Amino acid sequence: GPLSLSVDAFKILEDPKWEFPRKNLVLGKTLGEGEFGKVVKATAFHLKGRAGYTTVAVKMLKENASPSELRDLLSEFNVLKQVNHPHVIKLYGACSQDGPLLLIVEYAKYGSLRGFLRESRKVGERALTMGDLISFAWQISQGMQYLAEMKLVHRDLAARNILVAEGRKMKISDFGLSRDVYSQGRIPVKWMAIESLFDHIYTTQSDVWSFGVLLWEIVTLGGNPYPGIPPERLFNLLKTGHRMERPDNCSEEMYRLMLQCWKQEPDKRPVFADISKDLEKMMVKRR
Amino acid sequence: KILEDPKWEFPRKNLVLGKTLGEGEFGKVVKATAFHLKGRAGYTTVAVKMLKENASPSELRDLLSEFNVLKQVNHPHVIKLYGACSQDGPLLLIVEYAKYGSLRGFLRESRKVGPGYLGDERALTMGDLISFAWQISQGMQYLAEMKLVHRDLAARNILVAEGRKMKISDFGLSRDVYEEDSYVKRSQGRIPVKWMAIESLFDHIYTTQSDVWSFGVLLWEIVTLGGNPYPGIPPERLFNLLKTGHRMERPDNCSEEMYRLMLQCWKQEPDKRPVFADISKDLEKMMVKR
Numbered sequence A: 001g002p003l004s005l006s007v008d009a010f011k012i013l014e015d016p017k018w019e020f021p022r023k024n025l026v027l028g029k030t031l032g033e034g035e036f037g038k039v040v041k042a043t044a045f046h047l048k049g050r051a052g053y054t055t056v057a058v059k060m061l062k063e064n065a066s067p068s069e070l071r072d073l074l075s076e077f078n079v080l081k082q083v084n085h086p087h088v089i090k091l092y093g094a095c096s097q098d099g100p101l102l103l104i105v106e107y108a109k110y111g112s113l114r115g116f117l118r119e120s121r122k123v124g125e126r127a128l129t130m131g132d133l134i135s136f137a138w139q140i141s142q143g144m145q146y147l148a149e150m151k152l153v154h155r156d157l158a159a160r161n162i163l164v165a166e167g168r169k170m171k172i173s174d175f176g177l178s179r180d181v182y183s184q185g186r187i188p189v190k191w192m193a194i195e196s197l198f199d200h201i202y203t204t205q206s207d208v209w210s211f212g213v214l215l216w217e218i219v220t221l222g223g224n225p226y227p228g229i230p231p232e233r234l235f236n237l238l239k240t241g242h243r244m245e246r247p248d249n250c251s252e253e254m255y256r257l258m259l260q261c262w263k264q265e266p267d268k269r270p271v272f273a274d275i276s277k278d279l280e281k282m283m284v285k286r287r
Numbered sequence B: 001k002i003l004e005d006p007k008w009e010f011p012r013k014n015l016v017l018g019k020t021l022g023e024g025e026f027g028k029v030v031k032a033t034a035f036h037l038k039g040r041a042g043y044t045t046v047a048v049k050m051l052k053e054n055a056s057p058s059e060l061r062d063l064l065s066e067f068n069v070l071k072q073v074n075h076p077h078v079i080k081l082y083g084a085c086s087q088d089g090p091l092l093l094i095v096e097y098a099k100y101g102s103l104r105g106f107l108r109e110s111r112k113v114g115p116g117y118l119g120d121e122r123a124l125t126m127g128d129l130i131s132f133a134w135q136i137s138q139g140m141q142y143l144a145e146m147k148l149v150h151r152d153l154a155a156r157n158i159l160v161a162e163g164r165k166m167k168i169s170d171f172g173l174s175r176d177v178y179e180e181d182s183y184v185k186r187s188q189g190r191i192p193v194k195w196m197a198i199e200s201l202f203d204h205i206y207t208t209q210s211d212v213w214s215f216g217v218l219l220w221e222i223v224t225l226g227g228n229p230y231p232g233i234p235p236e237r238l239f240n241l242l243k244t245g246h247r248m249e250r251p252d253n254c255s256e257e258m259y260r261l262m263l264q265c266w267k268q269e270p271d272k273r274p275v276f277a278d279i280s281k282d283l284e285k286m287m288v289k290r
């Protein structure tokens, strides 16, 4: 079937460009674990023609992995080969010839955005300003603009899936559900667009909805979307035009931007260029 | 939406939630108590399955589907549904409480907690292990008769109730097969590779005979007292390993007869595997001959 064909392809040593010798990777501490995989910090010797050791993150599966988890890992690898942008997590390669499948990616020293924010606190505890957050959103929007031009739909945009690198640079991560636009879903209900929920449709404009949820997570420094509303009742609330209210410590201009990402009609949402543009304008205008 | 079935709906105010017995990424099982449950006077200890805030539509759909399936099935070795609260908030599924937890959990504890395995409800012999497998085969026999495929048979998905009685659980992945005697779907499954029959892995086909393969894995689990299948082999290696005809070795605690039954469960051709009624008979014969 499709997976056996991808696994067999992958285990062929064909593209030397993305195949990294296992003996030059030294796995370090576990950065984090799910039910079916984990991320581990590592060092890689002579990665991509670089001197000495480069610190990397390594994604791998656990023993109880399903075909679904193996397909998402292989899918992520196949997608990140074609992308390069400063605010998208970089792929360095994979180990496909000795032991388990390992994906080698860019290390971002600070972890997930959601974590980084929940550690934080706002100011006019780690201290962040409105200019900081707007910077964050803008970085993500630039990365999303780039993806949308390559006609990639990310599907899983959320603060849990953005990483924070040195210099507080944002890296969009977790491409295992992405699809090249050019069945029941596995994206959490509370980040999905109404047409995704009712019609199982994903487009860049459903990424723009998810972006509005992610915007809300930023300004609330890691809040949980629609608190006290169970995922199962959200279908109905949204269909009748309820949305999250304007949060505390959030401007009228930011909130408007949010609400527009959540228009029922995908055509009436902004595109990522407009979202970037709004953010560029807010920042010059706050100096 | 979800259509209230009064036969099953339970008053939210009569349910009290306690500790988390365990959790995954998207959901939880919690220990609970239910007042005036299905006629019983007073409180009854039960277990409740529920979603977390990050739930996906697939996870909702699976919880609903476990609810659906459980309404139709009734057997001594299938976990009993009591009801659901599906109206004034989160969907809660109310099921029988099995006090020893999962089978894999229970067996792994008997490695270290005396009197342990011997050849108390904690003293275990090969005869007890044969019986646990037989109870499960009977429950699977009944499910196959009801035209279901479980798909996710594993020691982690069996519960151990008072009297060490086996209860098949975790019906979120089970599917009806009345037309065709198979369930197929185009996308990739969410059952762990190491329990999947070969034709499920390669061809996406699930039948009672792929549940037989998974039962075979479960037998190896049971005889290893909760061992991990294909120890140290990466999951993606199973495609090649299985198609080149390799199978797990006979574990040290296992009779020739028992291992023969396992290997029969893992025949490449699904028609060459025994059916659940044959498996139950094989296990009966083993039990009585000692």
Ligand SMILES: CO[C@]1(C(=O)N[C@@H](C)c2ccc(-n3cc(F)cn3)nc2)CC[C@@H](c2nc(C)cc(Nc3cc(C)[nH]n3)n2)CC1
Pocket: A031, A032, A033, A034, A035, A036, A037, A038, A039, A057, A058, A059, A060, A061, A069, A073, A105, A106, A107, A108, A109, A110, A111, A112, A160, A163, A173
């Ligand atoms: C959200 O990411 C984390 C997490 O716990 N994820 C869990 C839930 C998770 C689920 C599934 C799988 N899978 C891995 C597979 F191959 C398949 N699934 N791995 C991990 C893991 C890593 C993360 C992290 N922390 C720090 C301090 C640094 C850091 N740097 C990174 C991480 C990366 C990729 N680059 N740089 N990452 C912290 C949380």
Ligand SMILES: CO[C@]1(C(=O)N[C@@H](C)c2ccc(-n3cc(F)cn3)nc2)CC[C@@H](c2nc(C)cc(Nc3cc(C)[nH]n3)n2)CC1
Pocket: B021, B022, B023, B024, B025, B026, B027, B028, B029, B047, B048, B049, B050, B051, B059, B063, B095, B096, B097, B098, B099, B100, B101, B102, B156, B157, B159, B169
């Ligand atoms: C295999 O089940 C356990 C487990 O950790 N399950 C995890 C992995 C898990 C994953 C997904 C979700 N989801 C729940 C959803 F709604 C959807 N997913 N919940 C839990 C949770 C229950 C279990 C347990 N321990 C003891 C001592 C008793 C006990 N008794 C029970 C349990 C029941 C149902 N009846 N009686 N159960 C321990 C292991």
